[PDB]
Design a protein around this ligand. Structure first.
Ligand SMILES: O=c1ccn([C@H]2C[C@H](OP(=O)(O)O)[C@@H](CO)O2)c(=O)[nH]1
Length: 124
């Protein structure tokens, strides 16, 4: 059904907000993007840059993926992101998260034709 590329956009792209803002951002976004459907997804990152800029990372610095694969890339420029981390008192289906804004280089895995992001590996 949903392609890996489309899933990446649903899970990691949010260009509408320059920095997400609002302490409720993650609680609202993790739910709206259906990341709390089956379970409370532990951690998830939203990137506040244009789709084009994020897709372009696939042609940037080639770095090893955490899983050992070689199709991961690190952005040369830092990007505005928001990490969503589940709290301790968080109990499904009422998933709770802490919203933390940051400016770091992102690392994503890319594949396909067009060669686009299909997984968010890390931020550094
Ligand atoms: O800083 C991080 C680290 C991990 N994840 C993610 C990557 C995965 O989701 P994913 O392949 O769909 O993109 C999941 C399992 O690690 O959580 C983020 O969003 N940000």
């Amino acid at each position: 059904k949903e392609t890996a590329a489309a899933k990446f956009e649903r899970q990691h792209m949010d260009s509408s907000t320059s920095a997400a803002s609002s302490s409720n951002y993650c609680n609202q976004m993790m739910k709206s993007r259906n990341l709390t459907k089956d379970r409370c997804k532990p951690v998830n990152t939203f990137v506040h840059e244009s789709l084009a800029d994020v897709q372009a990372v696939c042609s940037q610095k080639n770095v090893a993926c955490k899983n050992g694969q070689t199709n991961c890339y690190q952005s040369y420029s830092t990007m505005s992101i928001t990490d969503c981390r589940e709290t301790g008192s968080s109990k499904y289906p009422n998933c709770a998260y802490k919203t933390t804004q940051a400016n770091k280089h992102i690392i994503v895995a890319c594949e396909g034709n067009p060669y686009v992001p299909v997984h968010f590996d890390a931020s550094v």
